[PDB]
């Protein structure tokens with residue numbers, strides 16, 4: 001990984017030691033980036049809802065993951081499931097159960113630093129996995145991106161600044177999350193997010209993530225070319241708010 005500090009250094013050491021999941025996949029790969037493009041063609045707002053318990057950017061929320069996921073199946077373009085253990089109180093078992101209960105695309109949100117975590121994502125039923133430029137070298141990114149593609153997944157490349165966007169372009173990312181939240185400091189900068197969005201070619205599927213809370217900001221971002229919108233805490237507090245974000 002990269003040289004890191006603070007909680008990101010801790011979570012990378014944890015991920016390096018995380019045991020593998022050793023069962024077989026029991027569902028097809030359902031492409032999230034293609035379903036986003038289909039929603040775009042249907043002029044349906046494409047919302048990626050997240051399930052987590054703890055978060056460095058929120059108070060804990062304890063709710064039933066299956067009631068939540070089955071509700072979101074009716075409205076969301078896909079579901080992100082936070083599986084990191086210490087800072088998100090996530091679990092592979094939770095991802096496994098959600099993936100078995102719904103038929104929309106599932107993104108595994110974790111801090112992927114070794115190929116076995118991609119094996120894990122595949123075997124658990126996730127359709128794609130996040131790769132975070134801030135924690136990986138260019139060599140590691142390209143290797144993990146190629147490894148995920150060899151399973152038929154199109155990884156979800158997470159960027160937060162200009163250096164990250166440069167690396168995402170270098171490595172041939174086709175599916176990019178422009179995250180407004182710096183993971184080291186937890187600060188949000190939407191001006192920087194919009195600058196990055198303006199520098200991404202049209203053929204890349206773009207997801208805006210980070211402090212999205214209002215229908216009007218979705219519409220503004222869609223006008224700038226963003227294809228889909230990620231929303232965590234707001235929907236974890238009140239799932240039914242997604243109906244307003246779409247309608």
Ligand SMILES: O=[N+]([O-])c1ccc2[nH]nnc2c1
Pocket residue numbers: 050051052080081082109177179181209210230232
């Ligand atoms: O909790 N999440 O599933 C989740 C998904 C994507 C994100 N991007 N930035 N933070 C994120 C959190």
